[model samples]
Target: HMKVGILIQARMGSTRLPGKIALPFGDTTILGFMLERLKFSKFQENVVVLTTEENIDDKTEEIAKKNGVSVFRGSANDLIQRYLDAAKTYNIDIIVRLTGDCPLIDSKILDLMVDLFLYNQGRIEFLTNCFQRTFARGMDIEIFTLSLLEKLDSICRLPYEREHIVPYVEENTEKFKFFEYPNERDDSKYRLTIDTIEDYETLKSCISYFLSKEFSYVDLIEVIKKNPSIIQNQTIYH
Candidate 1:
């Protein structure tokens, strides 16, 4: 069994919501919240923050240092390369790619994916249903082996994928193996990511509503369930 490492791709200068990662969510920043939650997860050894060498994301180094998480700096636009470089640097055989926007990223879902990977004997490449039904926006997760990542690094050339991480992989689906959750119980309408000012407000309000020590994925889901009108009323889907 290969060790799974979670690589969080972060940059300060997003076109829409600039510095969203650094924005404070509760006591800590949004990036800090993501790292903290991942730290609570079972795949601690496999979790590392991957940022870039750009001036905008320079604060990420200090944030990662303060939070005591391993971090690596790499290419800005070529995030696929950045991820592969980090994976190589950390000697990570299996990889899990999560984004900073997914502040309320469910560790339970991650645990489920990890379990699925272990049981599958075949060479598993792609893992997730995030983009399929828009279950969660930035809450999309990716899992692949180091070899497959390197393959993506070698051949990916699409403009959209060069900007994002998995578009090339998803676009060129037949070349690699794929897997997804048979989520018969669909919760596709839920929104738990930061994209716009309204998105930030929605998450901020949700976080403020339940800032208790007894918080879990289910607790967050319950918060959303109770306040169904919070972001559900808005078009946070896209």
Candidate 2:
């Protein structure tokens, strides 16, 4: 079996919401909450937090360590290279890319994606639900092999391309074998990523769902269905 690592990209400096990952969520910060919940993953031992080396991100590293998860610091602007360095540091063969802003990421869905990739037996190099976006926004997840990532590093040169991994493979779909998992029902429009004050407020108001400690994508969907005002009432940016 290939060594799969779950790498979560995080930083304290976000234009929309500075230090959003460190924002307090109940008894834990947002980063802490995300790391705590990710403990449920079947491959939790392989998870690592990829933050920057900048002093501004010291708190992010501290929070990840507090949660007992490994962390790697790299270039602040070159996110793709940061991921590559993290994969190398962990000896990761396959990588599951996640964002720190997505505290509501579903572990079950991740398991499903991992299972599909494993069963493919080399036929699949990349898999994700976000390329087509059938799943809910916060549940976004992507999987790709290190070989493909290295190929991206060799061929992609633009700063934007280097900052956002997986787009190169996405843009040239014909060159790589990949798959996009879809939900039975489309919830792509749902907003759960914390990128703005309004997004944070919505997440805070619905913190009870997470506090229950039994939350899932379905449970979050149910909460939104019962009260459409939480996310439906606001204009979602990106």
Per-residue CA lDDT of model 1 for 76-164, tens digit only, reads 78888888889888888878888888887777678788778767746677777665754545457777778877877777787667667
Q: Once superposed on the true structure, which residue ranges of model 2 sit more than 4 Å away at CA?
A: 232-238
Query: RMSD for each model, in Å, please?
Result: 2.7, 2.4
User: For candidate 1, what is the TM-score?
Assistant: 0.90
Alpha-carbon runs more than 4 Å astray in model 1: 182-184, 232-238
Q: Please, what's the RMSD in Å of model 1?
A: 2.7
lDDT by residue for model 2 over 31-116, one digit each (tens)? 88878778888988988999989898899889999999999999888888999999998899989999998987778888889889
Worst 10 residues of 2 by lDDT: 229-238
